[PDB]
Amino acid sequence: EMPQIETRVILVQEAGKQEELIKALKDIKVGFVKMESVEEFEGLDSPEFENVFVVTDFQDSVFNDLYKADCRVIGPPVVLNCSQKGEPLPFSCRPLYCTSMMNLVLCFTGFRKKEELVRLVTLVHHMGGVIRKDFNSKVTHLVANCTQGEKFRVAVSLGTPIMKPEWIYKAWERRNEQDFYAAVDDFRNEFKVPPFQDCILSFLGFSDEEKTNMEEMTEMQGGKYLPLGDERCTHLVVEENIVKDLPFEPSKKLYVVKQEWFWGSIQMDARAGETMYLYEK
């Protein structure tokens, strides 16, 4: 314990009414008080306690209120969960609604709009994950991301989960779910980046059955495919064998891979490092 004083929960507005809650505070020997108005705030400064305010929903008005006062805020879920798992109040620099994303470490690549980033960044925080400027080992459960990228490239080579922004929002929706944690395999799965995102493909040296099976798969691994030779292709795959050589010519930034890169990427469940399959001879 670093604050040298007994902790006390304030139940803010309609939180006061929520029942299972009180029973939980009582359940974990923590004293509460209630508060309906932001004027009542003044008389809550008490030498006897450090105050933790429970808010029912960020953001009621009262939320950006308490924030502005720099005080310690939390969501109902954080509490019940302490009574359920027989815990003590957790601490963090920031408001904490629940605990879905305790204690992952996230990282972002390919975001061009500030507003949205922040929104994500807040949500994680509430949940409450942390973020890292720089991609390293400590990065948990997560690169939140849009497909081309230098840390994406890395994250691939490490086998650390790459996630769609939707992961977060769809996780924040389950904020009031009891034993819900957002790194669980299945939920992670629904929301990872599909091996072929922002990918458009074409095939060479293949059976109209083999091929038309691949096409089927590509659209299914989140990719899109196009009739050969289009300029809007990202990569193009070959039978490195059967093709002793080639019919068309590419653009600089189009890819010319070997058969394996395709299944590699799928057995991997993540886009794969192209440099390794680049075509020669």
Side-chain angles (χ1 to χ4, degrees), residues 2-19 21-28 30-35 37 40-41 43-44 46-63 65-84 86-111 117-132 134-137 139 143-144 146-147 149-169 171-177 179-189 191-207 210-215 217-230 232-243 245-247 250-251 254-258 260-277 279 281:
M2 168 70 191
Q4 294 289 287
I5 195 63
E6 169 189 35
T7 286
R8 160 171 85 171
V9 169
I10 285 51
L11 298 214
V12 190
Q13 296 166 351
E14 83 283 37
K17 304 294 197 172
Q18 179 173 339
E19 179 50 41
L21 207 54
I22 313 284
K23 170 198 170 195
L25 303 178
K26 282 286 162 235
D27 201 272
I28 57 174
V30 193
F32 50 99
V33 162
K34 77 209 329 182
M35 150 180 172
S37 176
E40 317 173 39
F41 188 117
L44 294 154
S46 172
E48 284 214 82
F49 315 89
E50 183 216 328
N51 296 280
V52 179
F53 310 62
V54 174
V55 164
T56 30
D57 172 52
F58 326 174
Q59 308 90 24
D60 300 341
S61 35
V62 58
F63 180 94
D65 281 325
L66 304 164
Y67 157 89
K68 290 184 198 219
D70 298 330
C71 44
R72 195 172 158 206
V73 178
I74 53 176
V78 63
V79 171
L80 297 59
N81 158 78
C82 284
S83 194
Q84 282 313 292
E87 290 283 38
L89 282 201
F91 158 89
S92 70
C93 323
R94 317 197 180 63
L96 216 57
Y97 190 96
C98 55
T99 164
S100 299
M101 288 194 29
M102 178 80 71
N103 35 60
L104 315 183
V105 165
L106 275 50
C107 191
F108 300 66
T109 212
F111 287 82
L117 189 31
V118 179
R119 202 163 36 116
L120 304 151
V121 182
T122 298
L123 295 191
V124 178
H125 278 334
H126 286 354
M127 271 190 293
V130 287
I131 38 166
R132 294 203 88 71
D134 71 323
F135 182 57
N136 71 11
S137 42
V139 181
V143 90
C146 317
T147 328
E150 337 82 354
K151 22 187 171 176
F152 169 43
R153 269 158 49 201
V154 182
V156 155
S157 332
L158 276 146
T160 51
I162 297 76
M163 307 299 296
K164 318 166 50 184
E166 279 83 74
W167 183 38
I168 303 203
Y169 301 96
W172 178 231
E173 290 190 9
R174 286 152 83 146
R175 60 177 172 288
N176 295 105
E177 272 205 33
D179 273 309
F180 172 70
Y181 299 105
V184 282
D185 282 30
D186 48 74
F187 182 89
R188 178 181 58 115
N189 270 262
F191 290 95
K192 59 184 55 189
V193 168
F196 303 142
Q197 199 41 94
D198 301 277
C199 278
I200 274 77
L201 302 200
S202 51
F203 311 107
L204 198 87
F206 286 105
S207 157
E210 285 160 7
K211 182 167 182 176
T212 306
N213 280 118
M214 279 153 139
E215 309 164 359
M217 313 198 201
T218 290
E219 288 209 342
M220 184 166 284
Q221 291 294 343
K224 271 177 186 168
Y225 72 116
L226 285 184
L228 178 151
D230 200 309
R232 272 174 305 123
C233 280
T234 35
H235 321 70
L236 177 135
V237 195
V238 320
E239 167 97 16
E240 56 274 73
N241 331 329
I242 297 171
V243 179
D245 275 317
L246 55 80
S251 66
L254 177 140
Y255 298 96
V256 298
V257 302
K258 292 147 172 50
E260 293 193 349
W261 181 92
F262 193 65
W263 326 95
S265 304
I266 301 136
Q267 166 271 331
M268 257 181 162
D269 204 303
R271 183 166 169 180
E274 289 87 312
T275 61
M276 296 308 85
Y277 310 56
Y279 192 97
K281 183 178 126 71

